[PDB]
Design an enzyme around this catalytic site. Sequence first.
Site, PDB file in Angstrom:
ATOM      1  CG  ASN A  44      41.430  45.329  59.302  1.00  0.00           C
ATOM      2  OD1 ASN A  44      41.781  45.048  58.130  1.00  0.00           O
ATOM      3  ND2 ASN A  44      40.185  45.351  59.688  1.00  0.00           N
ATOM      4  CE1 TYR A  77      35.908  47.873  50.882  1.00  0.00           C
ATOM      5  CE2 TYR A  77      36.588  50.105  51.212  1.00  0.00           C
ATOM      6  CZ  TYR A  77      35.945  48.980  51.667  1.00  0.00           C
ATOM      7  OH  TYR A  77      35.334  49.048  52.897  1.00  0.00           O
ATOM      8  CD  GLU A  86      33.166  46.231  53.047  1.00  0.00           C
ATOM      9  OE1 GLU A  86      32.684  45.205  53.569  1.00  0.00           O
ATOM     10  OE2 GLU A  86      34.084  46.900  53.559  1.00  0.00           O
ATOM     11  CE1 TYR A  88      35.727  44.148  50.577  1.00  0.00           C
ATOM     12  CE2 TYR A  88      38.020  44.544  50.023  1.00  0.00           C
ATOM     13  CZ  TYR A  88      37.024  44.479  50.934  1.00  0.00           C
ATOM     14  OH  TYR A  88      37.269  44.702  52.286  1.00  0.00           O
ATOM     15  CD  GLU A 177      40.445  45.127  53.663  1.00  0.00           C
ATOM     16  OE1 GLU A 177      39.743  45.551  52.716  1.00  0.00           O
ATOM     17  OE2 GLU A 177      39.966  44.460  54.593  1.00  0.00           O
TER      18      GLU A 177
END
Length: 190
Positions: A44, A77, A86, A88, A177
């Site tokens: 990740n 982001y 958070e 997106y 990402e």
Amino acid sequence: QTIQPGTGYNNGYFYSYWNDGHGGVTYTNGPGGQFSVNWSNSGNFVGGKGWQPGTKNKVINFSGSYNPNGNSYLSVYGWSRNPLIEYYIVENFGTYNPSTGATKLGEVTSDGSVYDIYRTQRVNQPSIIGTATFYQYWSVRRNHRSSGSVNTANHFNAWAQQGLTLGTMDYQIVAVEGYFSSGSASITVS
């Protein structure tokens, strides 16, 4: 330059590069708003360039190429504080649509496509202020692309209309990402 994870400023842009330590990712800052990411059987990671703090009325331009092989996103982001969110604005993705199973909270038309709006919750997960429980807001573009302009106000206003409110802005980047995938990308922000 090619760098290990961290944050800073490069040619007048904020950058952030984070990975989980698995290996398989190379992040390079380029001139101006440019960055490149090449990854091969990664873990990740998240990396990109933009602004710290972001704003609620920024028009973000991005140009380049994005070639995932597996699970990855290309998004605007960022975070807000108080409340901690958070968010997106997903312009393109690989094998996984990140809104899968998630609660649809509306639609917005912006910058040449419809976007579907979603909310999810992260429980006791890492955040900019430490381990926390917080919501995530998503706008997911129907017509995928790797260049364009994003009028963030259209998204943030649509979210607010639906009851998805933002606090004080923290960083705001164009990010690649990945989650245990491969790919390449070269993006220039402005």
